[model samples]
Target: MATLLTTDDLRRALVESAGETDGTDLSGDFLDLRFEDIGYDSLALMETAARLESRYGVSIPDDVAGRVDTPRELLDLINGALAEAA
Candidate 1:
């Protein structure tokens, strides 16, 4: 079974990976916020993706990866990837 990743789950992963210091997501909400604006970089996105793959055993496709410029987009990509895995 594929592990379903919610926005909250992604937020948790982001917090775990990037820490709450830089992002300081008081709402635990990652939607619409650019990583760099939160004192991070693209590397954080890569790290988030890696953690998702590790947890859910799903690989993100190039098309999906190319389009993900926001955290909400990443969450959508993950859900799409999960559907593909199913």
Candidate 2:
């Protein structure tokens, strides 16, 4: 069975990329958190999308740039991208 992306994966990616030490639980309503809320800038978001695309072997659509604003949204987009790739 192939591995599937999960919220934890997203959380780990975010934490690893942002170097966040507060250990806040990244569950539920991630979209509610603004970019500044999580210390993510445009560059960080692009880097994250690149990492996710490389790791998952799926190309994130350009439209995702405008849609995925938070970890939850990104997770959903990744899940869909994975499914589409499969």
Residue 52, candidate 1: Cα error in Å is 1.0
- The sequence of per-residue lDDT tens digits that candidate 2 reaches over residues 1-86 is 26557766676667666654344444433456865566677888888789888887878889877677666678778888888886
**TM-score, each model?**
0.77, 0.76
Q: What C-alpha lDDT values do all the predictions have?
A: 0.71, 0.70
Off by over 4 Å in 1: 1-3
Best by the TM-score measure: 1
TM-score of 1: 0.77
- Reference-based TM-score, model 2: 0.76
* Candidate 2 clash pair list: none
On the 0 to 100 scale, the lDDT of residue 17 in model 1 is 73
**How do the residues 1-86 of candidate 1 rate in per-residue lDDT, one tens digit apiece?**
23667766676777777764562662466588777666556776677788788897788776776677777777887787777886
lDDT over C-alpha atoms for residue 59 of model 1: 89
